[PDB]
Structure formats: C-alpha cells, structure tokens
Amino acid sequence: PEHYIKHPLQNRWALWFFKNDKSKTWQANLRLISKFDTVEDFWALYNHIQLSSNLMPGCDYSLFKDGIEPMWEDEKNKRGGRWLITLNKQQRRSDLDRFWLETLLCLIGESFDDYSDDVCGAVVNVRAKGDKIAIWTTECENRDAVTHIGRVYKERLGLPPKIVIGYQSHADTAKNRFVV
Incomplete structure (x- = not known):
C-alpha cells in the first residue's frame, strides 16, 4: 500500500500570488493559485511555478492553511504577527530560494511541535x-508559542x-515585540 497511496499532509494549504498593479486595490491584486x-x-505545484528569485519585483507568494486568507484582517491573523527575515540584494541570490523552500517545509511538515497550530502561513x-x-502566527500575545x-x-x-530576527505584531505593521 505504501507504493500507491499519496501521503496526506496534516493540513490542507493554499498558495496565493500577488502582483503589484497600481490600477487595482491591494486586495484585488491577491489571487489564489491552488490548494x-x-x-x-x-511538489507537483512547487516544480511547476517560478522560483521566487525569478519573480518580478512587487510580487509575493503566500502559503496559508486552507480557510485563512494571507491578510491582516483575517480572523486568524488580526491578533497575530510575523517572524520577519529581511534579505539584502545579495541574499536574493544566496538565500532567497533556499530559505523560502525551507519555510514552506517548516509549514507543511508541522515542524514547530505543539505550536504548529499557531502557524497561519508564510509570505515571501x-x-x-x-x-x-515571514512566518505568520495567530496570537502575538502567546509568548511561548511565538518564541x-x-x-x-x-x-x-x-x-x-x-x-537577531524580530517578531512584529500585525497591528503595529498596519518595531519588534520579540527577538530571537
């Protein structure tokens, strides 16, 4: 049986794409790619789409648990925040693609033990x-899970x-609350 059943993930995930177009509102520029x-x-999806290093400036990918939209206003994001990784122009080449794929795996592989339930998604x-x-979590005031x-x-x-990397609440984004 191991030879013909697909391997279910612990969650269903939705990948989203964003393309800056000044003709439209921010929300209208956000589109669901697939689940x-x-x-x-x-892997079929990942192997089919552009690496983030090959995307035009002003685009985003976002991977969120199904039912959570990648925006502050979602019920599961409004009281949350993000662990933010900043990359200079030389780490677009060096680390952007490898860090993003590692982030994707931390999400779908539920790599944060009990607190993976606090994860909502991630954005590049x-x-x-x-x-x-960035990794988005649901509750900025849950210090144990966030840290x-x-x-x-x-x-x-x-x-x-x-x-040092920092964690910023989405309420502030719309300064750091924690650092590790």
Whole structure:
C-alpha cells in the first residue's frame, strides 16, 4: 500500500500570488493559485511555478492553511504577527530560494511541535529594495508559542547565532515585540 497511496499532509494549504498593479486595490491584486493536501501534490505545484528569485519585483507568494486568507484582517491573523527575515540584494541570490523552500517545509511538515497550530502561513515579498520572508502566527500575545516558533525557524534556516530576527505584531505593521 505504501507504493500507491499519496501521503496526506496534516493540513490542507493554499498558495496565493500577488502582483503589484497600481490600477487595482491591494486586495484585488491577491489571487489564489491552488490548494493541495498531500506531499505529492505539494511538489507537483512547487516544480511547476517560478522560483521566487525569478519573480518580478512587487510580487509575493503566500502559503496559508486552507480557510485563512494571507491578510491582516483575517480572523486568524488580526491578533497575530510575523517572524520577519529581511534579505539584502545579495541574499536574493544566496538565500532567497533556499530559505523560502525551507519555510514552506517548516509549514507543511508541522515542524514547530505543539505550536504548529499557531502557524497561519508564510509570505515571501520580492522587492527591489530588499526581499522579505515571514512566518505568520495567530496570537502575538502567546509568548511561548511565538518564541518557540522563532527559535526553531532560526535554527532550521541555519542563521548564525549572532544574527537577531524580530517578531512584529500585525497591528503595529498596519518595531519588534520579540527577538530571537
């Protein structure tokens, strides 16, 4: 049986695309690409779409649990925030694609133990001024979950223990609340 059943993921995920177009509101520029809920369907999707390093400036990918839209206003994001990774123009080449794929795997692989239920999704922003990768969690005031996700994420990315990453509430974005 191991040879013919697809491997179900713990959650169903939706991948979203954003393309800046000044003709439209921010929300109208956000589009759902597809959903998947197995390992096989994840890789089929990933192998079919552009690497984030090849996207035009002003585009985003977002991967969110099915039923959570990748915007502050969603009920599961309004009281949350994000662990923010900032990349300069030389880490678009060096780390953007490898960090984003590691982020995707931390999500679909439920890599944060009990607190993976606090994860809502992740976003990569490709920009001329510098790219960003972030994991969104549901409750900025849950310090245990937020700190533990931040520590695991930093190790899974392989960031040196001298670098500091920060967690910002979405209420502020719309400064750091935690640092690891």
